[PDB]
Amino acid sequence: MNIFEMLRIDEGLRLKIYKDTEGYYTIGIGHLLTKSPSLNAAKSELDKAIGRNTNGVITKDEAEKLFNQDVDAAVRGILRNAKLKPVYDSLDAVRRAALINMVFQMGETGVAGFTASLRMLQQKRWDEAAVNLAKSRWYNQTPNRAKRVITTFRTGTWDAYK
Ligand SMILES: [Cl-]
Ligand SMILES: [Cl-]
């Protein structure tokens, strides 16, 4: 298992514009297009992201290309974030993937706001971080996915995903 497979399970793959858990227009493997309520606005963002006139539908390859850029962007965002970097540097392979999953979902600023959990992870206090992680809007709105990520930090294995 790896980060790509992990997020492909968490996000699914949809080749037509759809609304995510929050009601925002998205496509592919969790690629957010826009927070605007306008479909045309989404379609326009989509065309600009793909580079062709899509009419709201993309191909598998096109979805995978957005996904690659999004994963790379999340890794690079962690590495540039003064708050996230040290956490990431301190973690093992599997757990690094869990951190990337969170940033991909909520963005770096969002994850950087989990001060206590970040500190707990850095300290390798797995069970404590897991409980703290669960006291969040994140966990309350998307509990099944949250539980999978939380299990991954707690255990350091991919068990939640097999
Ligand atoms: Cl883009
Ligand atoms: Cl969920």
DSSP E strands, 1-87: 14-19, 25-28, 31-34
Name every residue whose Cβ is closer than 8 Å to that of residue 61 and which is 6 or more positions away in sequence. Answer: none
Technique that determined the structure: X-ray
Q: Give the dihedral sign, CA 144/122/115/66.
A: negative
- Report the alpha-carbon distance of residue 96 to residue 73 in Å, rounded: 15
Which candidate, 94, 55, 49, 51, places its Cα nearest to that of 73? 49
Annotated binding site for substrate: 32, 104, 117, 132
From the CA of 33, which ligand is nearest?
1
Query: Hey, what amino acid is at 140?
Result: N
Is 158 in contact with 1 (CB distance < 8 Å)?
yes
Query: Hey, what amino acid is at 149?
Result: V
Compute the distance from residue 53 Cα to the ligand 2 centre, in Å. Answer: 32
Compute the distance from residue 110 Cα to the ligand 2 centre, in Å. Answer: 17
From the CA of 50, which ligand is nearest?
1
* Burial class of residue 72, CB neighbours in 10 A (0-12, 13-18, 19+): exposed
25-28, strands of its sheet edge to edge = 14-19, 25-28, 31-34
From the CA of 138, which ligand is nearest?
2
Domain locations along the chain: 1-162
Name every residue whose Cβ is closer than 8 Å to that of residue 86 and which is 6 or more positions away in sequence. Answer: 122
- Report the alpha-carbon distance of residue 88 to residue 107 in Å, rounded: 15
DSSP E strands, the chain: 14-19, 25-28, 31-34
Compute the distance from residue 101 Cα to the ligand 2 centre, in Å. Answer: 13
Compute the distance from residue 161 Cα to the ligand 2 centre, in Å. Answer: 13
- Where in the sequence numbering do the catalytic residues fall? 11, 20
**Under CATH, which number does the domain 1-162 receive?**
1.10.530.40
Measured in degrees and rounded to the nearest 5, phi and psi for residue 91 equal -90, 160
Work out the end-to-end distance of the chain between its first and last CA atoms, rounded to an integer number of angstroms. Answer: 9
DSSP E strands, 20-86: 25-28, 31-34
Query: Hey, what amino acid is at 38?
Result: S
Is 28 in contact with 56 (CB distance < 8 Å)?
no
Is 52 in contact with 39 (CB distance < 8 Å)?
no
